[PDB]
Design a protein around this ligand. Structure first.
Ligand SMILES: [Zn+2]
Ligand SMILES: [Zn+2]
Lengths: 132, 384, 385, 131
């Protein structure tokens, strides 16, 4: 069967109206815990959630310029911990050049290729980039 | 885990660490036989239980280890243990638990691995996005450099010191003199982690024989090393911002080890830790309470983690000098700590003979967790 | 291992066994949760230790299992166990040991494996160098037994027929229902006399067992706590001398140690879950476990003494021949199903006079010169009035 | 380059043209007979005496293999061959499927057991029916 070209409908929403894409969070209806998509709440084990759209802007908590990376991935590439105001940390690749990012730098959501799939086609996912 | 009765370490075994052409079973056999001979065990039926740590070699590691020693049988229940890097230490922990509870009076913990003769699925969210372990640790270094003003040269000092510690250690793989410049100038893996700041993949084994106080007397053990404490934890999972210059599981494991043993971090003379990366060691000075929250950099710079300091850290040379056979490192740390307490390390023996020795391994860790597991032992002088 | 104090089984967990598109961690979580809810566990923090069996999925199986349940942390030391097919049972043995010793009052054992989602001995092993295969190793045991007792390939086929019959109304089993001796005998020959239908398949699944002290059973309000009458772990003797392969050195000694420690004999066992990886393994184990005398296993099977009207219903869940075999899971899966039989909860495939004594057995591995690398056996008994 | 012979420590092939034989080792300290080892599994001694083993044995059990080890051509036969020295040898049997029986007398022979990593045959010991 053909491999995925988009990661992932459960974590990333691309509005039907053509509006700006956003990361999706889920709030447990029983305990009120906010987390990324799960079958059951890690805190109370409830299976009832409400989708909460997350901020498109975050801060680079930390990052690393990768010269020897994952097998098959073109190098150099950058990845980071991006902290969102909703008190949720997202791991994501950063768009741009090596030796240009800093800790606590403001970033914005963007869509781009994260890796080649099993059919050697790019998988489109969320990334973060410097704000213009 | 609270010890219901006293547990002591008799003999220890340790193979040379490096690139081996003999498999995990031969290495494990060599380390178990040495530990047994060191316990005045010249026959196969004295040991009542055996636990063996491995990562990727076999589903029946311990059985393949004890097969050539004629020890497999109705008198030797063998259980193999995994928690990535924690495996060799969990093997010793399980042996200690058998003795502490009175299930046995004498048991053995083996850690063995051979990689060179032969990590996460794409479904893991961070792996999907291109995560690599070196990059994960490099983010901890980048954040620490941002918060303390630490440089890549300061990070490099961990490799310099640990290779220096390993110089006269025949068991180590890489040893001797290396300058800060050579470490900093080696191939960049994930900024600021260079090739010389990362532990390598190696082969080796170690074994620890544990027994009751009465068994120490029975075997005629001259220098029994007392198990003051041992703690195993699993790593908390959440997607909230975390202080990555901290270590949730290492902090809670160490504090539980201090509470149970009655021994504080300032009393620790030597320490073997999970130095898979230079930054890991430096962060662990703080996480383990060897120094205050942002003082790890000052602790390193003042020579407090080397000869003549508060605590000689990685006196064997750590993972940065031995390399890292997944199943073996946890056991090997304990075997070396025991020999340092016994004043048996010749050319790399720590100065005032240590009386308190601590060891730490972690292992694994999916997205949302710092590590999947942590195992820490507190060992003390049990003679005099 | 002698129990220093009493240990009882609270809730049990079991997933469907077959070809799964969800990994070992999801299967293990489902099993763990089912067992916890079965133990009336509302505060997960009550579980003080976890042991998880696995063969080939991961180095940190349990941590990946309990991750989604928010249980990993300072209150849950997790240790993963391996001894090939013994792993699932060793996980519950380690949990039992924590409770029996007073290290904990409430522990969990989880066995989990997913083989089919992944693309899966060394040549240095003398028998492997010479072309040994597991089916051939077991087929040699069958050929020798046929020579000594006059047993036929049709008699061997009866084990598959019976186990698939036992599994008919079992929704957890993979293969089940009616299969004739002819269909089993006519299936693709692997290593004479072992046909494809006489070999257990590679499957995915998980099971979990919650263990606690008697005070913990009162505290949790367990209606039918299943007593751990005994549990034994051994490793297999190694030598290059002739051995009677219709016998099983390790199964005989693990069995006998289990009877000595738990003052329960083989003739008192009502149900038995065995390592039926091959039809001949089950047939030989009637003798090795003392259910009948040496040489009488064939007569025991032919007389229906190992099914519903007999002395001991062997493989009432349908065994490995009906569930398939997820390495890390089977040992735990035997215990979960034995508990549901003692509780009288297996409607459709529930054993006749409700069993009061349930025995379980898994081996695992075994290089040249060993019959098996490991053996784990549990003796479980009714713990309520 | 991969091995083309299995194994100098177990199988002696005389250069003089003499009949090949399996090699056994008796521990000088406990008297245990076994195949080559660095140390005795029974007493851990490292002192042994080489004992040449009988070329004739009995098929204790065997199996005609139709689905075997990947790389090995099928069908093939393997067995437990019991030697009078009370030592069991696992080996392939030369000949056809459905021709062997339990307790049948066999004799030591040399033949290819598998292709190595360089796709060259590995010569080792096998057993065959006595003429
Ligand atoms: Zn909730
Ligand atoms: Zn001997």
């Amino acid at each position: 069967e053909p491999d995925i070209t988009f990661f992932h409908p459960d974590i990333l929403e691309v509005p039907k109206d053509g509006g700006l894409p956003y990361l999706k969070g889920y709030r447990c209806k029983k305990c009120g815990q906010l987390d990324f998509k799960t079958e059951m709440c890690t805190n109370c084990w409830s299976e009832e959630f409400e989708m909460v759209p997350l901020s498109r802007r975050g801060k680079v908590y930390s990052f690393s310029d990768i010269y020897i990376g994952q097998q098959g991935l073109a190098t150099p590439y950058i990845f980071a911990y991006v902290d969102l105001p909703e008190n949720l940390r997202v791991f994501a690749q950063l768009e741009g050049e090596v030796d240009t990012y800093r800790c606590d730098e403001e970033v914005e959501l963007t869509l781009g290729p994260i890796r080649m799939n099993n059919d050697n086609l790019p998988i489109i996912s969320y990334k973060f980039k410097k704000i213009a | 885990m609270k010890l219901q009765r006293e547990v002591y370490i008799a003999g220890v075994g340790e193979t040379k660490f490096g690139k081996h052409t003999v498999d995990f079973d031969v290495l494990g056999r060599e380390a178990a036989l040495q530990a047994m001979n060191g316990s005045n065990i010249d026959r196969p039926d004295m040991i009542q239980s055996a636990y063996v740590g491995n990562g990727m070699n076999d589903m029946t590691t311990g059985q393949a280890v004890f097969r050539g020693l004629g020890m497999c049988g109705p008198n030797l229940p063998i259980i193999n243990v995994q928690s990535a890097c924690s495996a060799g230490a969990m093997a010793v922990f399980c042996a200690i638990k058998d003795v502490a509870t009175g299930v046995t009076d004498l048991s053995i913990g083996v850690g063995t691995e051979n990689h060179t003769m032969h990590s996460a699925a794409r479904s893991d969210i961070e792996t999907m996005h291109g995560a690599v372990m070196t990059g994960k640790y490099a983010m901890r270094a980048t954040r620490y450099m941002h918060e303390t003003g630490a440089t890549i040269e300061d990070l490099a000092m961990i490799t310099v010191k640990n290779r220096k510690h390993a110089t006269h250690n025949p068991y180590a793989w890489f040893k001797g003199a290396i300058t800060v410049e050579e470490v900093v100038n080696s191939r960049m893996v994930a900024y600021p982690m260079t090739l010389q700041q990362c532990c390598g993949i190696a082969d080796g084994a170690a074994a620890v024989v544990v027994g009751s106080k009465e068994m120490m007397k029975k075997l005629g053990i001259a220098k029994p090393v007392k198990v003051a404490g041992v703690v195993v934890e699993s790593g908390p999972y959440h997607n909230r911002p975390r202080d990555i210059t901290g270590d949730d599981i290492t902090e809670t494991t160490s504090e539980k080890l201090y509470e149970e043993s009655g021994i504080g971090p300032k009393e620790v003379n030597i320490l073997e830790l999970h130095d898979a990366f230079t930054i890991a060691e430096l962060l662990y000075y703080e996480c383990m309470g060897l120094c205050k929250k942002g003082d790890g950099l000052k602790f390193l710079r003042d020579g407090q983690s080397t000869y003549g300091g508060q605590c000689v850290v990685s006196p064997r040379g750590g993972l940065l000098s031995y390399g890292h056979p997944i199943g073996a490192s946890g056991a090997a740390q304990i075997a070396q700590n025991v020999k340092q307490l016994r004043g048996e390390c010749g050319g790399y023996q720590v100065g005032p003979t240590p009386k308190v020795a601590m060891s730490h391994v972690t292992g694994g860790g999916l997205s949302g967790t710092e590590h999947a597991a942590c195992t820490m032992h507190m060992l003390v002088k049990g003679w005099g």
